[PDB]
Amino acid sequence: TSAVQQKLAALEKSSGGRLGVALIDTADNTQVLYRGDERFPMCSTSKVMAAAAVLKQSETQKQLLNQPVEIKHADLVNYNPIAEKHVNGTMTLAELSAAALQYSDNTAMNKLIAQLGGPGGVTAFARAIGDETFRLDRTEPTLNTAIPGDPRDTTTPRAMAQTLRQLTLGHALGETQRAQLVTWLKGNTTGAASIRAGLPTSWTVGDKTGSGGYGTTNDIAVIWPQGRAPLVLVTYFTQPQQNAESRRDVLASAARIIAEGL
Numbered sequence: 491t492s493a494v495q496q497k498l499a500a501l502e503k504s505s506g507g508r509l510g511v512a513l514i515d516t517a518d519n520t521q522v523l524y525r526g527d528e529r530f531p532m533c534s535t536s537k538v539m540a541a542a543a544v545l546k547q548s549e550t551q552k553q554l555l556n557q558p559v560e561i562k563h564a565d566l567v568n569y570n571p572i573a574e575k576h577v578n579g580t581m582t583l584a585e586l587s588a589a590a591l592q593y594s595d596n597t598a599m600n601k602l603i604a605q606l607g608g609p610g611g612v613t614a615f616a617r618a619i620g621d622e623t624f625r626l627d628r629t630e631p632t633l634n635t636a637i638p639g640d641p642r643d644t645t646t647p648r649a650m651a652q653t654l655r656q657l658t659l660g661h662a663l664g665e666t667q668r669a670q671l672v673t674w675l676k677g678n679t680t681g682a683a684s685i686r687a688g689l690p691t692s693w694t695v696g697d698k699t700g701s702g703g704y705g706t707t708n709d710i711a712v713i714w715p716q717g718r719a720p721l722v723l724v725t726y727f728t729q730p731q732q733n734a735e736s737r738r739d740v741l742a743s744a745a746r747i748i749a750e751g752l
């Protein structure tokens with residue numbers, strides 16, 4: 491294995507859980523993979539695929555992002571920091587995308603899923619951009635149950651990193667839409683304790699966090715290191731006990747190991 495792979499395995503053993511890592515260094519297309527082909531519950535990292543799918547729709551439905559969407563009281567689920575302010579009112583699909591990505595609002599995510607026709611519409615977009623591994627099966631909040639062995643609402647680190655690269659640095663989306671997704675990720679509010687905490691502070695990071703049952707703690711990021719071509723990094727982590735507490739420090743530690751191996 492590589493030096494870095496030894497350090498990641500040791501971090502995993504110390505953590506007591508199961509760690510998945512996939513790095514793409516776009517400077518030379520090199521990769522670092524740890525459990526890169528195992529499935530992990532995506533939790534709210536799946537919000538990137540749903541927002542991107544709506545961005546793709548807006549390439550042909552040109553006013554779609556400005557369309558008002560009704561927020562009813564019955565729509566509110568378990569974490570609605572933005573949507574709860576607009577109950578008995580409306581939010582646009584742009585505003586719902588921003589709330590889902592930057593505040594991790596679960597009601598906003600459900601509106602994106604509904605716009606796409608259900609979880610299968612998010613999966614269909616993944617297939618349309620070449621991701622044969624991603625699957626979204628449930629709405630919020632149950633897509634976060636993170637039960638060991640359950641394939642629902644999972645992907646592999648390798649597949650997620652490749653897709654995040656295609657969406658943010660490649661041509662899965664049109665130019666304006668790619669830039670909008672990057673703008674949203676760079677403005678995330680929830681990420682300072684996760685991948686970002688293991689990287690030099692001079693680097694620019696856009697990321698999407700997630701967490702769920704079994705102490706599942708996740709982050710996916712696009713990274714612009716000072717003076718170098720961007721990286722894409724996926725860090726997924728899940729634990730044996732259903733009621734386990736989150737471990738964002740493990741994601742930071744994994745990111746730090748990756749950064750020191752560059």
Ligand SMILES: O=C(Nc1cccc(-c2nn[nH]n2)c1)c1cc(C(F)(F)F)cc2[nH]cnc12
Pocket residue numbers: 534568569594595596631632633634635636680699700701702703704
């Ligand atoms: O929805 C949930 N968590 C949540 C919601 C909004 C945002 C984020 C988040 N965003 N960035 N990190 N974490 C996480 C959740 C759901 C469930 C259940 F049972 F599946 F419904 C169990 C959980 N155990 C811990 N969290 C959960």
Ligand SMILES: O=C(Nc1cccc(-c2nn[nH]n2)c1)c1cc(C(F)(F)F)cc2[nH]cnc12
Pocket residue numbers: 568569593594680699700701707736738
């Ligand atoms: O909102 C969150 N978690 C949540 C929300 C609603 C319900 C439940 C839950 N349901 N059953 N158990 N827990 C859990 C959250 C958690 C975390 C953390 F630290 F990773 F655990 C980070 C976040 N950043 C923004 N939001 C979060």
